[PDB]
Symmetry: D3
Amino acid sequence: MDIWYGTAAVPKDLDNSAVTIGVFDGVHRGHQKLINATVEKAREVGAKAIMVTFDPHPVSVFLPRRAPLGITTLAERFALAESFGIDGVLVIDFTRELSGTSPEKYVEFLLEDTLHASHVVVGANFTFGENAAGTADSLRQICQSRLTVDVIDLLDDEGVRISSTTVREFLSEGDVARANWALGRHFYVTGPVVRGAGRGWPTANQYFHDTVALPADGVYAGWLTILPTEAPVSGNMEPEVAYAAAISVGTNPQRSVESFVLDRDADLYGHDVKVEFVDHVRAMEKFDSVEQLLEVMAKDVQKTRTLLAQDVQAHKMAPETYFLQAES
Amino acid sequence: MDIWYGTAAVPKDLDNSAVTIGVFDGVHRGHQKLINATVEKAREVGAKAIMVTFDPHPVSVFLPRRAPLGITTLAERFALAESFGIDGVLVIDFTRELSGTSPEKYVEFLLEDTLHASHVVVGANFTFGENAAGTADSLRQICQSRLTVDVIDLLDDEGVRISSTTVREFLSEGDVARANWALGRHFYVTGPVVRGAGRGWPTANQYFHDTVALPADGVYAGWLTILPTEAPVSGNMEPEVAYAAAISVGTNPQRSVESFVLDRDADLYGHDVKVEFVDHVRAMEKFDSVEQLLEVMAKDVQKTRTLLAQDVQAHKMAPETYFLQAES
Amino acid sequence: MDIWYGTAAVPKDLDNSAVTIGVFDGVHRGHQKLINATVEKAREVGAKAIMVTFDPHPVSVFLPRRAPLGITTLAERFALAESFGIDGVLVIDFTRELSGTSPEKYVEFLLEDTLHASHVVVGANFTFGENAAGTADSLRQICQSRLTVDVIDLLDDEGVRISSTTVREFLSEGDVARANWALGRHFYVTGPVVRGAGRGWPTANQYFHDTVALPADGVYAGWLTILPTEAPVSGNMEPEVAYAAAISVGTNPQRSVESFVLDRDADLYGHDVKVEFVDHVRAMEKFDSVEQLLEVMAKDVQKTRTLLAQDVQAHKMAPETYFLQAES
Amino acid sequence: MDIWYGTAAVPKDLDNSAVTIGVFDGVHRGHQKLINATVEKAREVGAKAIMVTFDPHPVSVFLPRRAPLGITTLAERFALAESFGIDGVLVIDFTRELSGTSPEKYVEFLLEDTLHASHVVVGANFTFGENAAGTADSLRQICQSRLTVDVIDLLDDEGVRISSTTVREFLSEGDVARANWALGRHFYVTGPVVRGAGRGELGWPTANQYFHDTVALPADGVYAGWLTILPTEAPVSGNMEPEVAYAAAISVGTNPTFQRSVESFVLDRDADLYGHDVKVEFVDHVRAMEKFDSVEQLLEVMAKDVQKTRTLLAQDVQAHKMAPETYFLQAES
Amino acid sequence: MDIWYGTAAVPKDLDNSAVTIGVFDGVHRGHQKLINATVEKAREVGAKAIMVTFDPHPVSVFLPRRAPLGITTLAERFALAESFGIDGVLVIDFTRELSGTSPEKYVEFLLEDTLHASHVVVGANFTFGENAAGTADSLRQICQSRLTVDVIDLLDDEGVRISSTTVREFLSEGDVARANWALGRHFYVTGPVVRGAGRGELGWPTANQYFHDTVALPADGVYAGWLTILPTEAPVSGNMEPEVAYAAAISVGTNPTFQRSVESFVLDRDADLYGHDVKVEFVDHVRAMEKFDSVEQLLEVMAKDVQKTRTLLAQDVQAHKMAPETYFLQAES
Amino acid sequence: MDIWYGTAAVPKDLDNSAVTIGVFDGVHRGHQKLINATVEKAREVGAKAIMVTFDPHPVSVFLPRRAPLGITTLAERFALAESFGIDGVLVIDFTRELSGTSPEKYVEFLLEDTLHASHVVVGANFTFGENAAGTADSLRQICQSRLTVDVIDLLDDEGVRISSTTVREFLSEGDVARANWALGRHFYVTGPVVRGAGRGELGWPTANQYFHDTVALPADGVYAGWLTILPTEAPVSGNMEPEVAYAAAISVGTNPTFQRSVESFVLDRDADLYGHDVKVEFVDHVRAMEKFDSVEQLLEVMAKDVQKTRTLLAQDVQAHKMAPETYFLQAES
């Protein structure tokens, strides 16, 4: 998949495309409908399936540093867009182009001149152009005879509107199971394992910037995977195997994620590690003794073992290769 | 109007004065009664109307950095004192003088030797001298035959005691209309417009230190005035005209004030700008899309247009020259 | 009393000891039972009474910087351990030794090889060894024929479990009288008096790090003692006399303690000062005038005078030499 | 004078203009030649004289946080531009436009489409468009028959090249006299007076100012100069009028960690200028920074700075060309 | 290769080993002699080659925050060790063990009890146990009949002693050529690419990296080198493959206050490497740091760095011994 | 000895006093002459010997944050004053009083009204009152018949002027021997011991102290000196008594950013002094600061500092005049 930064980077010789436009934060199940429709039409005509997306977040252009939290990083947005069949991602920076542009000139510049689009697929909530006056309905009429437009209703399921907004709310509530439900996969973060405490001490510590969306402080059951690597691994964990883990999300009074991998002793310093969240286990608490702390640690392991045993049975969610022991 | 810092700066040849003493933060309607009485008596005898005030706040002398928030800056206190006819302001720093001094020696030093006072006007809540043992009643008796004293009752109106304390409470509640009511004018702040976001982007951004009193975070209707200047102004705003504005007061997680001037495109970087608050519009909120943000922005403009149309009719409050459009 | 840091520092020629093991934070009344039993048995056999304690807090080894607040500093723990007759304190750093060690090897290494113990005294909540699998019951069986073990029930009094945890809760609630009740003495902090405001201004200002346990923000009645010194004292306070004081505990938005010594004018800059807490007086509040501030200051002095007059009558709590005036 | 941010803010009904393009930092005597040529042309043909300038600095666009120090603020660049008769300033942000543009495209879009220019005036060192490919020459060949191009040599005077660079160099060494000479005026900073060590005059300056680290300042030291209280109806504590240049000894310092300060000791006045906006003009270097160990020593040196200043300023008044119309200066204490 | 933290993590069923002990910072040509001897022995007798190394640095244990800069990270020390055939790394923390231990006790506990060693290999400068009492000699006398001891002289080559110290010295002056020569490879750092001034290429590097102050870096300046995108299935913006060394001009800077940066300008590609892990290999010094006052000047010097780099890298490819198997380098633009 | 903050704190029933006025920073041999004259007079006529001193430093009042470093703290100034028999210290804050006062007014208010002085003793460099107008001479003419004035020349000895300034100079270069000689005692700092790298002795100092940036410290380096545990009933970990001066090698450092540290390696003892107040006396410079790359090297140099210290301290004991009454020092390890 090509990734282009700004309209000028798009090849001039690209002759046909089917295009979808959004922030696409999280690439949730709504987002998947748009991508699915776009990919299929691209295949039909033998053109490229293009996603136009935005970075920085368009909200942060108008209201700096009050951008909504990033459900996925830009890099993961690319990975997800690819896994669903996107051929090219065009990334638009509104501080550089397409802000002052009118609905008419936007379609003309972006969709025709730049992307050579025969098809465009947007959500009903789609807006574009100076002061967001462009709508889905605008787009259908401005594209009359020029290109075909398919406007897709926002995904409603089980009485919940599935959007970036609702995924963020669930995450903020610590309800990762509903977030997972809206995303169509286990919510995850990835990052390098740092030195933590030293070398009840966690299998892995990671830190995330405050723009990263994360589950409420608390303890979750989930899976930890050492991303593909030739680097030596200290201990009895292997790369590319999803290992059962009790996960503590905390706030330095910058958010930390501490992972206790069940039934393994490893030290993951230096490695890049994926943490997938499955279910909530408990709220954060203060500890006043080593005894009390380990007691609670063990109850977390038991509850985690239980939740993940269930998770495995929903195998559309569960990883390919996992490691989960029946007991200690 | 002269401004003197400390007793030693007061001219030795000043032969007669009518004096009022207080913090005078905000110069609210109570404060105006004291100034009014003082100015009138000065005119009667042909003497100078003097305000004795204090900086730093006397509270911060005893309890550093737990001083009450400043309703007005010291500079604005001077401006307000002048606009009401004060001839001289004596500023007392209690870390330098008049702290260890007894009620008797205070009247002797400040009122007689320094100020040559024939009249003194204080509020009923007035205290002075070592450990604030001096009262209004003390002052009348210590001044027997030496100078005349007029003690003015605190202003009570509409079931509210009008004081610096109550103005601060209203501001903190986001109730600027009641604060305006107690002040006798639109509450305002002034300051240089800084670079903000770049060059839905606000007409002006200002920053204030944390000792400055400000309305609760939220959006207010008000008026913005470019203070007199020969500097070129980018855009279609003119100096000295009060322009209709939706005002956002925020906190950097130092307080910011962001102003959206209605129906104008200007950039006010470099200019000194007054922001007058008229009425509350809404609480702060997070935005998750550009669409949602602009929707709400437009409702704020509508509600603001409405509030200011009313404000103009209370013309004792409203500015001399304003700019308010009937619609977009 | 000897203080040894780590097992290697303990003299090799020490031939007999009676040993007690715990964090001992606060040396509360439960802790006193263990020490009492240990001291008595040491006297019986003519051996040394040893306390094994821990630093850093064992909790902070597993969960860095989420250690419980220190009721006493390590230095005060030593002082208290001594005042109750302990002959030697062995301080264990779990980041250096005794973490990976099994229950069996722990008793063998610490109690026998290092300490030459004929008696060991622990609380029922006592744990030891890798993953705290060692218990009081373990210890009795592993010590069969090797040394005698006396396991002491946690102290329950007046429906309250007396522990480090409960002392912290009381302190956090601002309930110093119950904390004092559980400690068996007035809760206190000690520290150098710093420059504060200048040279209603407090008799003394002290600052404490955020790991120090302190009463809730508010005003307390208590006693202030200038620790033994040959340094000149500014004012009419003498060292080693416990002086009546209204005490303000605050938070810089690092905790401060501001002390108003009743009926004295002293300046304690440079001196080391003990602050003992007796009872709660009021919550923190903002002040808006010097008048209001002094009014409240005076009510605090009255209420304090009252509480301390009562305190003196419970003379097991009250200091040897105090200073409390009947009135102003 | 109008100020437009971006080519999209330019009035669309602009039929004719004489344009000059550059960073214009400091508006030095070199820059004035460019502006002069442009204004004199515009004034001739009833058209508007436009300046195309750049904010943020093109270097900061390419090398973030490593741009040269600003000789003037953007606000002052506007004010100086207007003072020399420019009718419009167009501020280009290179992160937003005219960056990936070819020399040919740059001319058509900016100079024709946006500005509708009949004349253009640039420095011989002028480079434009992607990878600075366009030069003073490129401009002449591309513009044929459409608009007259006037290329102007960089100003050399007294064996010294007059550029933003040399001005920065002069300032940096504390040589304000050479900086002023290259600028065609007294170098100055403008700023609100802040609270000092306190209000009101054993020790205290008349005025305290702080400046960000992007602001070009003379080397740390003491200088002779003039302070002017910017126009205001707000009252002044002490015996100073607004809009009069007052003789001052000016101390430029750096903060222990934090930023630069400017402390002004106005000669033969006690006043406290907290609350006001103040212009500080530098005339000549007086001495390097020193450490003080006693109050007497500091007061002694203080009195020497007042004498040195008094003299240097007396010469500056006689050299008339740079001094202010109305001022205040006493021959002796 | 296994990694054990502390003597308690070592498999208890370890019957035979050839051991080498040292900080091993940088794994320079001196260190390789130690590892080589050890591996060649272990490989002979079917036993495991163990490295005993130390983290945190023994100096930081004795003098907190005053340890020498790390030539490589601990992660890279492991990777380099494994690359030379070490089977096990035992990481000793001196705050945790082997500190108050006597020479005699150190041998029995570590070398016999823990590691069950039949061979040991150390440098002539080797010191062990409490107060560094044990020396290369002590080791031989204590180990008699139990294990064979092979003491190896510090590597001298071309009149230069090859040690962590001299490597740090070389790096510090910007002499990467001598550092590489003493290392036996191109000096390198590894790190995630961060966001620059923005995404996508007037000014911007191909890649931006930041490094902590414990990381040894060449003196501030420009260098010729190779950048490699570490293995990944993640897509790459632009025309660059993972696992190919690409020619780059590399700029090493310090931050105004904060830390070190490494900016990579990959020759004849525009790509944006945000999100990837990137290895940057240093070949030769190109120039010292300079200040820029104009966009043209910076682009001019930029083009000169590309030429210098192109040449230096051409020589590095010919000197083959240190260059990478697969790479990308063009003779001209 | 009484301590009064402000003229209003002075007992109103003070009928007679001999007064000396000055900053008195460091209480050096010059200052002792002033105090001696004053005490010897007061002691004669049954009156109190008063010191008028100043806090904050008069320079910091005039030039905030640019006062000279404090040779001693205000606490130590009091203690030193009392040690030389001063009965009362009056601390004047120039932000609060005696600032706008005329020479004539200063005498009447402070010397007569407040202190009721019959004798006064000042240095020839003495200046008092608004704009330092009053000098040593002014004082004599204003005081006639009311109080006897004794002006004392600044102390010159061995071609060296003894002043706060020169003491600061000596300290700054690391020449504690000359500082001590000018002071008439071992220079010292006093402070609570903080936690080091940890508790208890491979590497670790006996004691760690930190000092603010207003505190005068010898140049970074190693020094010979004595450490004394200030009087206490609190237990001491290790084999050290309170109130005994113990031989120590003393390392003075600066923090990477943050502040100064003082680390004390007490000779032939292991003790941990966390929790105690400790006095550290400097005797002689041992060496400049160095960087360490290996544990052996640091221990080697460590042992050399112990030898150098042992010798220098042996000489200091023989020169008796400055050494302490009770001390602890061993001839060899």
